[PDB]
């Protein structure tokens, strides 16, 4: 037990580790300028001075012991808090009525107000530094900096970028970027953590500057004397704080704060968008955000410029010969209805394919498949999951039965070991990686990284193995064979919970340590270390991504990961499981709502006569029995005169499908092509009709992230011009064909779909209001499933299945193609950059594509930074500038996807795909390099984050502040 007496009254302490934690739950007034629950105690502000048994101590750090007499009201404790506040006010100038941070949530402002402060003992003295306004997105104002170290704690221990430190050893301490370099030139990855956690305007987003307040637009030349006049005139702090509070209240008229779910990646970050009219002031994250908390990356925090891009499509386009004609919505919808009916009558319903966008909502995916099956009468639906973790879902379907990750991001941060296979986790799922990086950096979590490119996760991993491209299943099978034969497998688990064990051990026969060392290149000794770490860890989370799945044996390698987890007993328990990291913001949800050729919503098979009959009764029409084409297969069927129409929504297929020369050739043949997008994408150029769609900020709906977490979107802006949200468009197209759908809000679409999809039975918009979320399967009672397979596996006998898998040798291109072109993404850029190149701040620090060349290959071919080369494959060629870096080795190069022309990676890639799930093998691309130009400007500027110099450390180093001569603890001011 733990009984404590606070201010005389005795009470029972629950789970509060610290005194401040108890005081907060008990609703007892105590200043905490530097305490942010997401960061933990820092002990920098010194305003939580309470008396723990007569001793003045900081309550944020004070551990709540049994039988502690804490007092938070005596004159000495209050005199100590005001002393700590005086130093904060000496380092921060209060000018609230004309400050953009005076939005009711300023911790300095409300603490001065809470403490009934009227005078300032230490007058504000300007720091001897200028504002660091070098970065495109945020700025540092050292004069307003209170040296609380909240930004340092976030950069170091939450984000784990380690750019920010405080030079305590300096006469006037200041927040330093790297070894005191300008923000723009530092390793600052622009995540936004430092501005988010800053308790004042010291670290603020440039979007807020001059925009948030009514008097903040006044030029600093006139506003500065106004502040100096007010400072001199001032009778008391409470008088002008009331004036600032009335102005703060007035801001509610202009500034609109709306909850949204990030339109970028599968981490599923939710946050509030602050908008004054159409201007996005700042993306304000909230602690209640289920998947991210206060965490964000550059894309979600600052990459929203595209919504207001002058290039946004605001009117439907109908092709008129050699150009696009702007036409009325009625004529565009009437033409789509006339042509779709024409090809359906003359060539059948199967001569029409439909592509759903994983950028769009769950309801929009549901309506696209309802149009394809219920209206047109074909099963030709699919989404970008085909090029993505389709092999990963095939692997999970074969072994554990659910097409989703085993648990939450919270389970990943809890894991004893995190095995990362073919996943640039800190650049593709940044907020998810912050949990792994923090766990490894502070909790001592073991991190194993299997990859061909040395990225942040590889640099920070406990063990970085580098297997040959496509050999991943060879070492995975060998780890399982060694663990099973050495008796280190979880036999209690394999017993009552798994099937096909003896057939599985028979298939592991060829995968001996010698074979693994021979095929993968990883020595037997390190293979023992991997197996020992995997086996000895109590909880193992296996995170895999496109390095595993974008291969011919991608489905099998994914199955091998699930099989290994079954062997070691890492399922149905917290901190363990299979985590194929879901690509797009709503790839999980687009698949969850039947945007696949083989399955209807809730993953119920199309060929299942019982499932089809359920939908027939509800939809009031017969469903097609035969499955349809995949996203990859669709271009082959256009070429063979089988597919006469394609309705592609929010997918850049003309650049993202493999072998884009063959893709483009099929686009010229195609009878009718409807592209629905927010911009005239590369794909939209090949369209006969382009429909202006509205992005995430201009619509309502739901997204399902990597954790199967259904989250709700609120409308930030009204749809720009005549662009309509995708659901409204799909519905209007269906209505033109006689569907008679009567939805008024996406919530109407969700109610219909929850009744039909069994895994979504209990989902209602009411259960998803605000920051509330539901993880599927959600039964009709509203009870969700945060952690899968706790009681049983979803198979008739409740037991998982070990699935025999073989190594499928990666496709060999030929001896003349000696360069293995590895490809992927960049932290700052999203695919070819239709969204991210509109963000000028992102463009500024990463303006173009580049080809990573190893120092070995650069020495051999005489390559320097900026050397224009020509990678040529049997499918096409790219002309790209070069960048030397030890991230790539030998003859493996790295070509990111951020280019829409000469350097489009999919000009090199081949149409060879996974044998079971048709996922293009993008990580099996070879080419030969021919030098075109020798001298050129480096494609990566000095200001790019990759050209930085992090300063890793544990914490803020508050002990360095206490070591100074000027430091006098406020509590120590007694005599």
């Amino acid at each position: 037990k733990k009984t404590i007496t606070i201010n005389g009254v005795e009470m029972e302490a629950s789970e509060e580790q610290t005194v401040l934690q108890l005081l907060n739950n008990s609703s007892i007034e105590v200043p905490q300028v530097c305490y942010h629950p997401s960061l933990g105690p820092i002990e920098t502000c010194d305003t939580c001075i309470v008396s723990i048994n007569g001793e003045l101590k900081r309550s944020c750090s004070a551990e709540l012991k049994d039988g502690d007499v804490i007092d938070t009201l005596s004159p000495d404790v209050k005199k100590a808090q005001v002393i700590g506040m005086d130093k904060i006010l000496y380092n921060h100038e209060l000018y609230c009525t004309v400050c953009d941070y005076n939005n009711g949530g300023c911790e300095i402002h409300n603490t001065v107000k809470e403490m009934k402060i009227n005078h300032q003992s230490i007058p504000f003295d300007h720091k001897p530094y200028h504002k660091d306004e070098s970065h495109p997105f945020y700025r540092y104002d050292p004069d307003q900096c209170i040296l609380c170290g909240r930004c340092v704690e976030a950069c170091q221990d939450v984000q784990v970028t380690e750019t920010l430190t405080i030079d305590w050893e300096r006469k006037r301490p200041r927040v330093i970027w790297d070894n005191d370099v300008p923000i723009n030139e530092s390793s600052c990855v622009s995540c936004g953590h430092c501005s988010t956690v800053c308790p004042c305007n010291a670290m603020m987003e440039k979007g807020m500057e001059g925009e948030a307040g009514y008097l903040t637009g006044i030029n600093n030349e006139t506003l500065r004397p106004m502040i100096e006049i007010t400072k001199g005139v001032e009778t008391g702090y409470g008088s002008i704080l009331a004036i600032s509070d009335m102005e703060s209240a007035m801001r509610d008229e202009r500034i609109k704060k709306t909850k949204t779910v990030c339109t970028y990646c599968g981490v599923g970050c939710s946050f509030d968008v602050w908008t004054k009219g159409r201007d996005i002031l700042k993306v304000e994250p909230q602690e209640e955000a289920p998947a991210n908390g206060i965490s964000t990356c550059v894309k979600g925090k600052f990459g929203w410029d595209f919504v207001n891009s002058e290039e946004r499509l605001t009117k439907p386009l109908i092709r008129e010969g050699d150009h696009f004609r702007e036409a009325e919505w009625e004529e565009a919808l009437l033409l789509i209805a006339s042509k779709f009916t024409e090809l359906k009558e003359a060539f059948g319903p199967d001569s029409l394919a439909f592509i759903t966008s994983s950028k769009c909502t769950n309801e929009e995916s549901y309506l696209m498949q309802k149009l394809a099956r219920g209206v047109i009468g074909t099963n030709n639906v699919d989404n970008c999951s085909r090029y993505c973790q389709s092999p990963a879902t095939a692997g999970l379907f074969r072994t554990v039965g659910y097409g989703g990750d085993s648990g939450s991001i919270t389970d990943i941060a809890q894991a004893d070991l995190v095995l990362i296979i073919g996943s640039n986790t800190s650049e593709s799922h940044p907020v998810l990686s912050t949990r792994i990086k923090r766990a490894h950096k502070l909790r001592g979590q073991k991190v194993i990284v299997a990859d061909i490119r040395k990225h942040e996760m590889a640099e920070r991993s406990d063990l970085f193995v580098q297997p040959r491209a496509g050999s991943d299943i060879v070492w995975l099978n060998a780890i399982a064979k060694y663990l099973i034969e050495n008796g280190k497998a979880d036999e209690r688990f394999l017993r009552e919970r798994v099937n096909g064990r003896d057939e599985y051990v028979k298939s592991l026969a060829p995968y001996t340590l010698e074979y693994a060392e021979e095929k993968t290149g990883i020595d037997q000794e390190t293979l023992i270390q991997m197996a020992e770490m995997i086996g000895q860890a109590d909880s193992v989370c296996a995170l895999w991504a496109m390095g595993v799945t974008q291969h011919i044996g991608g489905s099998d390698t994914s199955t091998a990961i699930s099989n290994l987890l079954l062997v070691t007993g890492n399922y149905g328990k917290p901190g363990a499981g299979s985590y194929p990291l879901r690509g797009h913001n709503n790839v999980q949800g687009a698949s969850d709502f039947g945007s696949m050729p083989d399955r209807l919503p809730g993953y119920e098979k199309v060929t299942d006569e019982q499932v089809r009959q359920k939908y027939e009764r509800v939809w009031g029409v017969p469903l097609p029995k035969e499955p349809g084409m995949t996203n990859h297969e669709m271009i082959e069927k256009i070429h063979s005169g089988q597919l006469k129409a394609m309705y592609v929504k929010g997918e850049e297929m003309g650049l993202v499908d493999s072998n884009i020369n063959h893709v483009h050739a099929a686009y010229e043949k195609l009878d009718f092509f409807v592209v629905q997008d927010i911009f005239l994408s590369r794909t939209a150029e090949f369209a006969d009709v382009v429909l202006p769609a509205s992005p995430s900020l201009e619509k309502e709906g739901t997204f399902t992230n990597t954790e199967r977490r259904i989250q709700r979107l609120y409308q930030v802006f009204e749809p720009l011009g005549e662009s309509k949200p995708d659901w409204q468009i799909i519905m209007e197209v269906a209505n033109k064909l006689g569907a008679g759908w009567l939805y008024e809000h996406p919530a109407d679409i969700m109610e219909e779909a929850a009744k039909l999809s069994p895994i979504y039975a209990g989902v209602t918009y009411e259960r998803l209001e605000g920051y509330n979320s539901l993880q599927w399967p959600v039964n009709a009672d509203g009870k969700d499933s945060p952690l899968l397979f706790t009681e049983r596996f979803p198979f008739p006998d409740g037991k998982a299945i070990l699935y025999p898998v073989q190594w499928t040798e990666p496709k060999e291109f030929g001896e003349e193609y000696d360069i293995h072109v590895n490809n992927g993404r960049l932290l700052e850029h999203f695919h070819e950059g239709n969204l991210t190149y509109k963000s000028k701040g992102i463009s500024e620090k990463t303006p173009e594509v580049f080809l990573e060349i190893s120092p070995e290959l650069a020495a051999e071919r005489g390559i320097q930074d900026g050397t224009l080369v020509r990678l040529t494959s049997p499918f096409g060629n790219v002309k790209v500038k070069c960048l030397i870096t030890d991230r790539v080795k030998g003859k493996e190069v790295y070509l990111p996807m951020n280019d829409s022309g000469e350097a489009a990676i999919n000009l090199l890639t081949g149409s060879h795909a996974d044998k079971d799930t048709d996922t293009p093998a993008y990580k099996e691309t070879s080419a030969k390099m021919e030098i075109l130009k020798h001298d050129g400007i480096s494609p990566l500027p000095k200001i790019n984050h990759r050209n930085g110099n992090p300063q890793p450390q544990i914490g803020v180093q508050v002990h360095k502040k206490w070591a100074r001569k000027d430091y006098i603890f406020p509590g120590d001011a007694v005599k």
Binding site: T222, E228, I229, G232, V233, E234, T235
Partner: protein, 86 residues
């Protein structure tokens, strides 16, 4: 307006103008403490003194005894007695 305000604020930025506005606000706070409710009889007496001081034409010793004088000097001494509290 941007220029008019710029000129106005820049000219008022002087510490002489800041003190004028500072003490004007504080003067009202000082007046809030001053019990002007009980000033009514004192103002009527000071009013009667002003009225008699306009009708004009060792004397200090002779005048310090008159019934009219004694009431005023005892009230002046009573005022000094009040200014002896904590």
């Amino acid at each position: 307006g941007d220029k008019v305000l710029d000129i106005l604020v820049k000219k008022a930025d002087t510490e002489e103008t800041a003190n004028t506005l500072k003490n004007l606000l504080l003067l009202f706070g000082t007046l809030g403490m001053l019990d002007v409710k009980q000033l009514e009889p004192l103002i009527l007496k000071v009013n009667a003194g002003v009225a008699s001081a306009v009708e004009q034409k060792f004397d200090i010793i002779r005048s310090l005894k008159d019934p009219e004088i004694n009431k005023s000097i005892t009230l002046l001494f009573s005022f000094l007695k009040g200014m002896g509290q904590d």
